[PDB]
Amino acid sequence: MPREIITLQLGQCGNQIGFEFWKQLCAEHGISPEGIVEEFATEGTDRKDVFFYQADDEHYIPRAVLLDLEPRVIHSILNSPYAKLYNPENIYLSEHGGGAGNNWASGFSQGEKIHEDIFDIIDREADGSDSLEGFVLCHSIAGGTGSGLGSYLLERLNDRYPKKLVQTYSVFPNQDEMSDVVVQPYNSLLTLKRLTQNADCVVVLDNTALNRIATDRLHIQNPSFSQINQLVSTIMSASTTTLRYPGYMNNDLIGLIASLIPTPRLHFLMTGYTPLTTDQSVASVRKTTVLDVMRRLLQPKNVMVSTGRDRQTNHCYIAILNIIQGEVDPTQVHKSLQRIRERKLANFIPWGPASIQVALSRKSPYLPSAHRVSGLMMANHTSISSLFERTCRQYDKLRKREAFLEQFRKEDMFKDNFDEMDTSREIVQQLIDEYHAATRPDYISWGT
């Protein structure tokens, strides 16, 4: 049986991402907003049971959990056509409806208050899974609900489900923009603490990188939350394509993530997407070759991560996984790898063998694709530390100024001290250094 995945969408940003993801999956699989397979959805080649459950022999219901501490967003979601896609028994809603006020400590306290409800929802969804691998949390690290409640949920899942895998879709705060969320460094610190102690995999979604990509790549002068959510949904779709387009390889999440996490500590993943196109440039289906595809993917303008230009650290890729979707010629893949090696388009770890894995994938048959070939890059690249290093520097800048800490001291999670934030900052600094160390042969002894 498939390894079912429960999707947890946390806070405003996380819930928007989850909703758009479920919409995109429905569109790709030809699933109606009510969870019933459309008559046109005759291609039974997708593995819905990883991410969706069948309610009947005909109705596929997303294995999606929509979680918010504030009722406004949940009520707005419940007014969409997709209200029937998610199993209502897998939905835990905080009774107080007040949200976390963009406070991680408040989100954690709300999670503690809704702990029973959340774990009841989780168990109810778990019994519906024949071979549940684990839970996937989609949230923002900058808010209160997705950060605080998400951290609480991660802690309780780690304590209660120690044998299940924990993947996260964690939206990280913009590190290049001055965050209006003065406690974002506190929220980010608490989320990094939980990722270090209680998460098994952290997918970093930098809102700064999303805005940068929308401006430079999507030609969006003022990226709306909706446009960012649609880009995120496209990324999630690409990440789930191997579930949605079954094939010979990478048919399971553990197979997908094994190449990205060489050691249990090296569990911080960076993402890449291809082809990156501006909304206006859909018109010309470019006959991109695997070499051409990878070359455009190797361009930072097409990279879904905005890493700062670190001049001091010779950042390098620790590992690369290329998930390519669409019509792919194996000889073109071979030539692409050859050209990448000849051109040294990727630097690998010096302390062990490392390479770019390439997967060729089919597109969803129910959604007409304007592009013959699409691609996801999963990469471990030390320059991703520069995003983490930039977040750490912003944290240190607030902590050194004690800015907005009185509001956290008002909350019980932060009432007595901010030691969790300082330990998180130190751990994130060590993470940045290790990512830089992972470019060096001495990474074998890094952190010893």
Binding site: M1, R3, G44, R47, P246, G247, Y248, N251
Partner: protein
């Protein structure tokens, strides 16, 4: 048309070539405990039931030729089968084919094979040499 040569080849790809990777992943995830048993401890009826249950419970249920898929218990372990195959191109092919089955209780993983029932005239294409290869 009548012998559906292309359809037979596509079926072989789906099942014998493990093209339906999610089906095989699910089947192996369910069956590993049984394949972990010693060859003498494997209940053939249990393996057959698990095979049919994986076939019907996976997307392999969507294969129109899924009913042509049979379970084959290899007379040699995967290691012994490998040794036989390595001997196939060698004068040892007869010696490894005639090599007694390894007294080591082969795991179900080592004994596992598929069979496919080909009728004449479609059996003309999936010949015993072709089926064995």
């Amino acid at each position: 048309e009548e012998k559906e040569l292309v359809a037979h080849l596509r079926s072989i790809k789906r099942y014998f070539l493990m093209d339906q990777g999610d089906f095989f992943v699910h089947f192996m995830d369910l069956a590993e405990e049984e394949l972990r048993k010693p060859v003498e401890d494997i209940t053939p009826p249990r393996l057959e039931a698990l095979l049919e249950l994986a076939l019907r419970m996976s997307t392999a249920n969507t294969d129109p030729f899924k009913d042509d898929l049979k379970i084959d218990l290899m007379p040699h372990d995967l290691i012994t089968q490998l040794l036989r195959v390595l001997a196939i191109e060698t004068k040892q092919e007869k010696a490894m084919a005639h090599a007694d089955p390894t007294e080591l209780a082969l795991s179900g993983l080592e004994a596992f094979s598929f069979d496919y029932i080909v009728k004449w005239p479609l059996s003309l294409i999936i010949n015993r040499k072709a089926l064995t290869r």
